[PDB]
Amino acid sequence: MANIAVQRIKREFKEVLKSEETSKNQIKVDLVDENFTELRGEIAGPPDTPYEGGRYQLEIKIPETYPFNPPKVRFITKIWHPNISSVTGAICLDILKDQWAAAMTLRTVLLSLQALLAAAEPDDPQDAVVANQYKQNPEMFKQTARLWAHVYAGAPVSSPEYTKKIENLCAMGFDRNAVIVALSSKSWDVETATELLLS
């Protein structure tokens, strides 16, 4: 792309490759093209969180107006978090928005995303259903997120309860992802999720 921004990316790409955080497998970043319009990111779910042991694939796009506008980051790996869309992976993080500063590296971006995973902002939500599940029922939110971490992001297995209900509905013939979404959305009540799956 633009000469200047291209040497930034290559510097930042190198910063990350050499970082402590990468040697400890918390974050990683890879290029795609010659052109540096696009990067592939990965983050480890932070310890003591529902996302622990998870691994999350990130789509990083660099617009024409970078560094002055932020990079466009989306979650490829589905996640249950009030500040990420459970459907598209669209993100609502302060630093990619109106707290963004041009001096912010890709390393800083990736670490902030890990931080957002350990500290939700349900009073500024990307997913209505999830944020409301967070505030009204924290314990259910922790279990629901943990299940997604297990099914989509490879985290050690979740709650017997939730999976019984899933493999009960999948035995009925429905699509897993559809089932998982339904239960997660209709707050693990079988009767209502079931009427949704028909709809």
Partner: protein
């Protein structure tokens, strides 16, 4: 069978809460009770603005024990005049073919709608009934008043 009955019990429960107004789908009785969930008395009203407007065409809807692994057999009672409907009454359709476009998620609701949308818009490359095909391929208006008259045979 255990698997199939479970899903169908729930399929009816959802249909009883909501269906597209005007449709019928209801499990038959077994002698003494009982009730038979693997055989359904169902009905479809042809969407308005069509020649199929003003009519209610009945079909039986039989389920195998494989269901939802296999689709239901759908038979119009009695046999219907339609290029895509067999002379024994069986609806021939991709989403209703086991190893083609059937999927275990597909609801009864979506079947009946899928059949309803097959009514006015037929699938030429896929013929089930000689006589109805023979017509649709040369003189459309002869097919039209045929549909008009067939709908007229069935009281709303």
């Amino acid at each position: 069978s255990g698997i199939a009955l479970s899903r169908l019990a729930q399929e009816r429960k959802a249909w009883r809460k909501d269906h597209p107004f005007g449709f019928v789908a209801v499990p038959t009785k077994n002698p003494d009770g009982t009730m038979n969930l693997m055989n359904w008395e169902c009905a479809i009203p042809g969407k308005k603005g069509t020649p199929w407007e003003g009519g209610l065409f009945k079909l039986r809807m039989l389920f195998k024990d494989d269901y939802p692994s296999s689709p239901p057999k759908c038979k119009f009672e009695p046999p219907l005049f339609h290029p895509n409907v067999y002379p024994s009454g069986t609806v021939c359709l991709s989403i209703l073919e086991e190893d083609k476009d059937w999927r275990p998620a597909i609801t009864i609701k979506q079947i009946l709608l899928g059949i309803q949308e097959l009514l006015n818009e037929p699938n030429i490359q896929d013929p089930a009934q000689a006589e109805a095909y023979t017509i649709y391929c040369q003189n459309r208006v002869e097919y039209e008043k045929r549909v008009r008259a067939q709908a007229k045979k069935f009281a709303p």
